[PDB]
C-alpha cells in the first residue's frame, strides 16, 4: 500500500530542505521498514501533482494509499497506530517522560538566535545552556528497564544509547531534528557548541550520528545555515 511522504525542497528546488517536522517523519518511516518514498516540493513551484493532492499546501504530508493526512504529530500517530507488530515494530516511547525531555531547547534556541539585542545575549545562551542541561539530566538518570544494575565508577548513572532505552523511539524522531539545527546554527553564528561536559547530551548525539537513519535524512549543513541566516545575522 503506497506510503508517500511530501516534504519542502531547499535552496535548488531539489534538494531536502531545512524542516524538523520533514526529517522526523523520515525517521518515523525508515524506522517502521515499511516501504516508501519522498518527494520534496518547490513551494515556489509547485507541480500540478501536489497542488491536486494538497490544495491547502501545508508540508509535511503523507499520501497514504489514496489519502491526504497533515500536521505532523497526527501524521506521526496515524503512522504508528497502522503501521504495528507483528509487520512493524512499535516505536512509541515505554516510559512517558522521554516523550517530554528536551521539548523546550527548541523554543530558547529560537529566541537566542533571533535576538539582535546584545544587552539579552549573555541571558539567552543561559537560557539555551539550561534547558540543554534538563535534557542530559534526563539522559543520566537510569530508566526502570535498568533497575540496580551499577559500575562501581559510575553508581547511578545510565548508560542507555537514547531517550528512552537502547532504541531509537518517536521521542527520538520529533527530538533530534530539532538538537541538530540547533548545534547546526550557533556553531555557525553565535561561536556555540553543546559543552561536552553534559556528556549524557554528547554520548545522546555521539550514537544518533553514528545511526543512519538520523544521518541520512539530515539536510546538507549548508542548508540549515542557508535558511537561518536571515534571523540569525540580525545580532551585532
Known sequence: PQVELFVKAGSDGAKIGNCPFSQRLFMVLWLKGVTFNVTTVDTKRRTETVQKLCPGGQLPFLLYGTEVHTDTNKIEEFLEAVLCPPRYPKLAALNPESNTAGLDIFAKFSAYIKNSNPALN???????????????????????EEVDETSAEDEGVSQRKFLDGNELTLADCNLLPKLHIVQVVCKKYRGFTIPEAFRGVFRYLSNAYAREEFASTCPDDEEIELAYEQVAKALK
Open 122 to 144: 549573555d541571558n539567552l545562551e543561559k537560557g539555551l545552556l539550561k534547558a540543554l542541561k534538563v535534557l542530559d539530566n534526563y539522559l543520566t538518570s537510569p530508566l526502570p
